[PDB]
Amino acid sequence: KTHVQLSLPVLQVRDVLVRGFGDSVEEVLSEARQHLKDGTCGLVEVEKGVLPQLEQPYVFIKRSDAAPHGHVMVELVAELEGIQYGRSGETLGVLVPHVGEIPVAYRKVLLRK
Known part of the structure; x- marks a missing residue:
C-alpha cells in the first residue's frame, strides 16, 4: 500500500x-x-x-x-544545518526512536510509504 494508518506515541x-x-x-x-x-x-x-x-x-x-x-x-522531510530534503506542509512534529517512554497522547497519521 502507498499509505499506512499509524498511531504514533507523542x-x-x-x-x-x-x-x-x-x-x-x-x-x-x-x-x-x-x-x-x-x-x-x-x-x-x-x-x-x-x-x-x-x-x-x-x-x-x-x-x-x-x-x-x-x-x-x-510525509517525511529531513533537516541538516538549516537545509530540508523534501517539500511538504505544516510540521506535526519530529520523529524519534521509541524505546518504551510513556506517551502523553497519540497522533493518528496516514503515512505516505
Missing part, C-alpha cells in the same frame, strides 16, 4: 532516550521509515527549545494534504 522531549535516527539525511529517513513500519517510532511536538534538545539530522512529519478515518496524511 513523547515529552525530556523523556526521549534516543534523540535521533543517525548521522546523515539518508540514514535518518531510512531509519525513520523502518521504525514507522516496526511500530518503534515516537513523535515530539515542536515548540520553542525542543529541537536544540534533539540530534540533527531531524526527521519531520509534515501534512501532505487537507484526513481519512481521523488519520492526517503526512
Whole structure:
C-alpha cells in the first residue's frame, strides 16, 4: 500500500532516550521509515527549545494534504544545518526512536510509504 494508518506515541522531549535516527539525511529517513513500519517510532511536538534538545539530522512529519478515518496524511522531510530534503506542509512534529517512554497522547497519521 502507498499509505499506512499509524498511531504514533507523542513523547515529552525530556523523556526521549534516543534523540535521533543517525548521522546523515539518508540514514535518518531510512531509519525513520523502518521504525514507522516496526511500530518503534515516537513523535515530539515542536515548540520553542525542543529541537536544540534533539540530534540533527531531524526527521519531520509534515501534512501532505487537507484526513481519512481521523488519520492526517503526512510525509517525511529531513533537516541538516538549516537545509530540508523534501517539500511538504505544516510540521506535526519530529520523529524519534521509541524505546518504551510513556506517551502523553497519540497522533493518528496516514503515512505516505
